[PDB]
């Protein structure tokens, strides 16, 4: 609803370099490299195949929109997870320690024994602390506080 | 907004409102902000409240808070789109878009002479970040802004 629609049409036309109303793998490749990516040919087929519901090998306007929705939803979620990670990981060393987890939980009350336990639940590789991979994987199937930390920190 | 959005907004307000009196004070906005590693002065805390303090009671009620979040989100989304679009253009990383950067990129995408000149307020011959910001916030000129916006947006979605 609205002129979201002019935005969508602008977005599509930036990909549809020839104006014919479809985006090919080529077209996609060319915009992607201007964005500072270097996608392989296989990467490009697959972004086409996920949204190619009519099977024709290219992306039209409702397919592109679905591609946008899926990609918007997963950038946003993954950006907020990564902001919440950065919030806990205050020394920037790539791992959430128990003292870091505690400090953050507090400032927003867990005993040391409690926070060791939160870690153990998420600590797939056994090293006593929570890396990015593990944080990601905890955030998946409260949490909800963490999720709002990540959104908020973003927006701030 | 679906119930998931509201619940999240509600979470968020209850991160700030560390007690629960339904109001958000300067003391409380400060605590939470420092928990995300920022260091705002009292004067920045007070401005944040005053910008959305519709009934002038120097504190933030739940709808004021929504209002603060909606503006900061749109302002963050905006700033990040513009920055990314800067980054797509400033290919050599040096903090200025030259005419040739700008031409290379447009020709590449199939969307210069002198879009540069109109943007280059300090007269140094190319487009610094502030000037890119100014031009993107200040039909034909406008079609160009709109094309560039879609570039910042797309950028953001694919990084
Ligand atoms: Ca095309
Ligand atoms: Ca198709
Ligand atoms: Ca750490
Ligand atoms: Ca671990
Ligand atoms: Ca309160
Ligand atoms: Ca108020
Ligand atoms: Ca440059
Ligand atoms: Ca200049």
UniProtKB/Swiss-Prot annotation, chain B:
Residues binding Ca(2+) 3: 90, 92, 94, 96, 101
Record-linked SUPFAM superfamilies: EF-hand
Compartments it resides in: Cytoplasm; Cytoplasm, Cytoskeleton, Spindle; Cytoplasm, Cytoskeleton, Spindle pole
Q: Which Pfam families match?
A: EF-hand_7 (PF13499)
Gene Ontology MF annotations = calcium ion binding; protein domain specific binding
InterPro entries found in the cross-reference section:
CALM/Myosin/TropC-like, EF-hand-dom_pair, EF_Hand_1_Ca_BS, EF_hand_dom
Q: Please give the residue positions where the record annotates the modification Phosphotyrosine.
A: 96, 129
- Residues bound to Ca(2+) 1 are 17, 19, 21, 23, 28
Post-translational modification here is noted as:
Ubiquitination results in a strongly decreased activity.
Q: Which CDD domains match?
A: EFh
**In the UniProt record, does the keyword Acetylation occur?**
yes
- Note the Gene3D superfamilies from the entry: EF-hand (1.10.238.10)
Keyword set for this entry?
Answer: Acetylation, Calcium, Cytoplasm, Cytoskeleton, Isopeptide bond, Metal-binding, Methylation, Phosphoprotein, Repeat, Ubl conjugation
| Binding-site residues, Ca(2+) 4 | 120, 122, 124, 126, 131
User: Glycyl lysine isopeptide (Lys-Gly) (interchain with G-Cter in ubiquitin) crosslink: positions?
Assistant: 18
Q: Which residues are recorded as modified (N6-acetyllysine)?
A: 18, 91
Offer one example of a GO biological process linked to this entry.
Answer: regulation of release of sequestered calcium ion into cytosol by sarcoplasmic reticulum
Transmembrane helix as UniProt keyword: no
**Residues bearing Phosphoserine?**
78, 98
Q: Which family does it belong to?
A: Belongs to the calmodulin family.
Remaining remarks:
This protein has four functional calcium-binding sites.
Q: What does its UniProt record remark on the domains?
A: The N-terminal and C-terminal lobes of CALM bind to the C-terminus of KCNQ1 in a clamp-like conformation. Binding of CALM C-terminus to KCNQ1 is calcium-independent but is essential for assembly of the structure. Binding of CALM N-terminus to KCNQ1 is calcium-dependent and regulates electrophysiological activity of the channel. The C-lobe interacts with KCNN4 channels in a calcium-independent manner, whereas the N-lobe interacts with the S4-S5 linker of KCNN4 in a calcium-dependent manner playing a role as calcium sensor and gating the channel.
Protein name (record):
Calmodulin
Name the species this protein comes from. Answer: Bos taurus
Gene it is expressed from: CALM
